[PDB]
Design an enzyme around this catalytic site. Structure first.
Site, PDB file in Angstrom:
ATOM      1  N   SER A  26       6.228  32.457   1.956  1.00  0.00           N
ATOM      2  CA  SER A  26       4.844  32.809   1.690  1.00  0.00           C
ATOM      3  C   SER A  26       4.383  34.081   2.398  1.00  0.00           C
ATOM      4  O   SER A  26       4.664  34.276   3.580  1.00  0.00           O
ATOM      5  CB  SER A  26       3.923  31.645   2.072  1.00  0.00           C
ATOM      6  N   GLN A 105       8.055  28.470   0.758  1.00  0.00           N
ATOM      7  CA  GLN A 105       7.675  28.301  -0.646  1.00  0.00           C
ATOM      8  C   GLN A 105       8.869  28.653  -1.535  1.00  0.00           C
ATOM      9  O   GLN A 105       9.085  28.016  -2.568  1.00  0.00           O
ATOM     10  CB  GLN A 105       6.448  29.153  -1.031  1.00  0.00           C
TER      11      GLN A 105
END
Length: 197
Positions: A26, A105
């Site tokens: 992220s 992520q």
């Protein structure tokens, strides 16, 4: 170099033997982020610069922090982007052995993409490394539809995302040593297990 597009830029007439597709964490930069470059240089040392193509997941994957809360741990657009890269690799270089990886992520993105991929392409990924795997607890340390022996998860003690949370604590930013050593070691070993020398 935080941006690598070796697969997209590469000549299909001179395909590498190994193609590595990586999804960053992220808010990270380029398409390789913080850990990708370290993994990449070690892969290059092992297979040579023309022996391996490094490809980060860019395009629609904006690595937006908020998307960690979506059902699959990332956006549908991002999954579509990574699936497209695996498909491009399969058509551009049919004989290449694939390897993948993702951080934070990007690890959820790698798991979701691999789960949705047609089995014929998925079966070509000799090994996948996941750091700070946000779906670690939910998936019981596995990537759905993918063998445990080809998977290696790096989840630090105290990295809350590995235990069902979305809170970012210090251990989540401490995968540097793993990216420099055991992660590429695992990937190289898995490639050699199927390719030989």
């Amino acid at each position: 170099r935080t941006t690598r597009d070796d697969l997209i830029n590469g000549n299909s007439a001179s395909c590498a033997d190994v193609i590595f597709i990586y999804a960053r964490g992220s808010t990270e930069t380029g398409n390789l982020g913080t850990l990708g470059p370290s993994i990449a240089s070690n892969l290059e040392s092992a297979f040579g610069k023309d022996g391996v193509w490094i490809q980060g997941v860019g395009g629609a994957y904006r690595a937006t922090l908020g998307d960690n809360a979506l059902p699959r741990g990332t956006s549908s657009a991002a999954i579509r982007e990574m699936l497209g890269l695996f498909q491009q690799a399969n058509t551009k270089c049919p004989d290449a052995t694939l390897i993948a990886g993702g951080h934070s992520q990007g690890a959820a993105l790698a798991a979701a993409s691999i789960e949705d991929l047609d089995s014929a392409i998925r079966d070509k990924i000799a090994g996948t490394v996941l750091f700070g795997y946000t779906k670690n607890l939910q998936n019981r340390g596995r990537i759905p539809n993918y063998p445990a022996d080809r998977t290696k998860v790096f989840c630090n003690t105290g990295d809350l995302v590995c235990t069902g949370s979305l809170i970012v604590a210090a251990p989540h930013l401490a995968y540097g040593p793993d990216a420099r050593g055991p992660a590429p070691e695992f990937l190289i070993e898995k490639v050699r297990a199927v390719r030989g020398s």
